[PDB]
Scaffold this active site. Structure first.
Site, mmCIF file in Angstrom:
data_model
loop_
_atom_site.group_PDB
_atom_site.id
_atom_site.type_symbol
_atom_site.label_atom_id
_atom_site.label_comp_id
_atom_site.label_asym_id
_atom_site.label_seq_id
_atom_site.Cartn_x
_atom_site.Cartn_y
_atom_site.Cartn_z
ATOM 1 N N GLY A 1 -11.763 9.620 0.042
ATOM 2 C CA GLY A 1 -10.504 10.078 -0.505
ATOM 3 C C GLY A 1 -9.477 10.578 0.486
ATOM 4 O O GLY A 1 -8.491 11.189 0.061
ATOM 5 N N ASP A 2 -9.678 10.370 1.785
ATOM 6 C CA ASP A 2 -8.758 10.877 2.801
ATOM 7 C C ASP A 2 -8.573 9.855 3.923
ATOM 8 O O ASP A 2 -8.634 10.181 5.109
ATOM 9 C CB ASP A 2 -9.240 12.220 3.350
ATOM 10 C CG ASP A 2 -8.140 12.982 4.059
ATOM 11 O OD1 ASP A 2 -6.957 12.702 3.773
ATOM 12 O OD2 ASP A 2 -8.450 13.854 4.897
ATOM 13 N N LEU A 3 -8.355 8.588 3.564
ATOM 14 C CA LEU A 3 -8.220 7.525 4.565
ATOM 15 C C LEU A 3 -6.804 7.523 5.152
ATOM 16 O O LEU A 3 -6.021 6.586 4.987
ATOM 17 C CB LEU A 3 -8.561 6.171 3.954
ATOM 18 C CG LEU A 3 -10.007 5.942 3.516
ATOM 19 C CD1 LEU A 3 -10.109 4.703 2.645
ATOM 20 C CD2 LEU A 3 -10.907 5.818 4.734
ATOM 21 N N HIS A 4 -6.490 8.584 5.892
ATOM 22 C CA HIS A 4 -5.215 8.630 6.588
ATOM 23 C C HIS A 4 -5.341 7.970 7.960
ATOM 24 O O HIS A 4 -6.391 7.440 8.333
ATOM 25 C CB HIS A 4 -4.700 10.065 6.712
ATOM 26 C CG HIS A 4 -5.607 10.984 7.470
ATOM 27 N ND1 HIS A 4 -6.164 12.111 6.905
ATOM 28 C CD2 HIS A 4 -6.024 10.964 8.758
ATOM 29 C CE1 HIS A 4 -6.898 12.736 7.808
ATOM 30 N NE2 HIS A 4 -6.833 12.060 8.940
ATOM 31 N N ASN B 1 -8.238 9.143 10.469
ATOM 32 C CA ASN B 1 -9.644 9.023 10.097
ATOM 33 C C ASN B 1 -10.172 7.611 10.284
ATOM 34 O O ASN B 1 -11.322 7.340 9.923
ATOM 35 C CB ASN B 1 -9.872 9.456 8.646
ATOM 36 C CG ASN B 1 -9.933 10.964 8.488
ATOM 37 O OD1 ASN B 1 -10.092 11.698 9.467
ATOM 38 N ND2 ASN B 1 -9.826 11.433 7.250
#
Ligand SMILES: CN[C@H]1C[C@@H](N)[C@H](O)[C@@H](O[C@@H]2O[C@H](CO)[C@H](O)[C@@H]3O[C@]4(O[C@H]23)O[C@H]([C@@H](N)CO)[C@H](O)[C@H](O)[C@H]4O)[C@@H]1O
Length: 325
Positions: A220-223, A226
């Site tokens: 949920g945090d594929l910025h 990452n």
């Protein structure tokens, strides 16, 4: 002995926010931690930037990720621990756990548990994209990332609490954000007040959006930082930070990936979807706008696009998540 006062200096949300990435504060603690695990100590050990949790990288050496009590540290630690258990043999490039421990006992004070993992090669997606005018190599890399994401989604959900087929964490989070999102976006000021007034009726029910969908392993945090890539070799060399993982809807993964890492570029999104053979439906744009509003984070924080002056949230959905022009 320094550790007692140093760690006692964090006792509030504001106090933890000011010292989470303070390198002078964490460096001796991290070195002592590595000595406690019986691991070699790198000559250089640095806080690589803004991390939610205290993180230090050794120049040859590993990554040390510490978890506090304040900034959702316990929940994030549980999530990332379960994720590393589940990813043990995943066909995805992730780091390996080199060790884990606690800085201090942890009875009257916070034990400050920490993980130690291997270092990923390559550059961040964010750097690689910001340093190229070669759009063709970037799109080929995005297709490769689409293949990798297709494999990541299908890692079997063999966890105990969060990464199970019947976990309710993801729907509960989505309902909470469905409640709070419109006031959030009023406070943030990314969009027009008319669109925000139409939002509460436009947004669907969580149970309706999730009906009949299969659970996937959702990062949920594929910025942009990452994800580690080798642009020249068209290779995804790493995917890190499993503090926000869910047994959830595959579409949720796309939000932070597109609005943060892809900077809202619909052409890069199309390349990524092509790589995964992720077929677009008629309501795909509207569904992904709904997931944009139901996300836990402020995903627009990094979108280099002015979305103010927008009426008819349908038009905003077509603009953000539509096909390329
Ligand atoms: C179930 N939801 C929580 C899950 C935790 N694993 C997160 O760490 C936590 O998120 C964090 O909360 C702390 C407070 O406890 C700060 O708010 C951090 O700042 C946040 O959330 C960060 O960082 C996010 C990302 N930038 C993190 O990479 C977004 O910017 C958010 O809008 C922003 O509040 C979430 O709320």
């Amino acid at each position: 002995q320094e550790s007692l006062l140093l760690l006692d200096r964090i006792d509030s949300d504001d106090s933890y926010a000011s010292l989470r990435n303070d390198q002078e504060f964490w460096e001796p603690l991290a070195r002592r931690a590595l000595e406690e695990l019986g691991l070699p100590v790198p000559p250089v050990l640095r806080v690589p930037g803004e991390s939610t949790n205290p993180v230090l990288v050794g120049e040859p050496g590993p990554v040390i990720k510490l978890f506090g009590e304040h900034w959702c540290g316990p929940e994030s630690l549980a999530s990332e621990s379960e994720a590393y258990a589940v990813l043990a043999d995943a066909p995805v490039p992730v780091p390996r756990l080199l060790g884990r421990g606690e800085l201090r006992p942890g009875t009257g004070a916070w034990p400050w548990p920490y993980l130690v993992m291997s270092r990923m090669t390559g550059t961040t997606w964010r750097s690689a994209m910001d340093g190229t005018t070669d759009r063709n190599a970037l799109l080929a890399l995005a297709r490769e990332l689409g293949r990798v994401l297709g494999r990541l989604h299908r890692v079997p959900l063999t966890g105990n609490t969060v990464l199970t087929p019947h976990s309710e964490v993801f729907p509960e989070l989505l309902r909470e954000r469905r409640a709070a999102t419109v006031e959030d976006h009023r406070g943030w000021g990314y969009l027009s007040p008319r669109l925000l007034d139409r939002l509460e009726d436009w947004l669907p029910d969580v149970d309706t959006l999730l009906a009949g969908r299969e659970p996937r392993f959702v990062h949920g945090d594929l910025h942009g930082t990452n994800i580690f890539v080798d642009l020249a070799a068209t290779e995804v060399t790493g995917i890190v930070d499993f503090t926000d993982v869910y047994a959830g809807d595959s579409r949720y993964s796309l939000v932070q990936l597109h609005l943060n890492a892809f900077r809202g570029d619909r052409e890069i999104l199309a390349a990524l979807l092509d790589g995964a053979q992720w077929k677009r439906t008629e309501d795909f744009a509207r569904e992904l706008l709904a997931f944009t509003f139901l996300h836990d984070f402020e995903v627009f924080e990094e979108t280099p696009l002015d979305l103010s002056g927008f009426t008819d949230p349908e038009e905003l959905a077509q603009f953000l998540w539509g096909p390329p022009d």
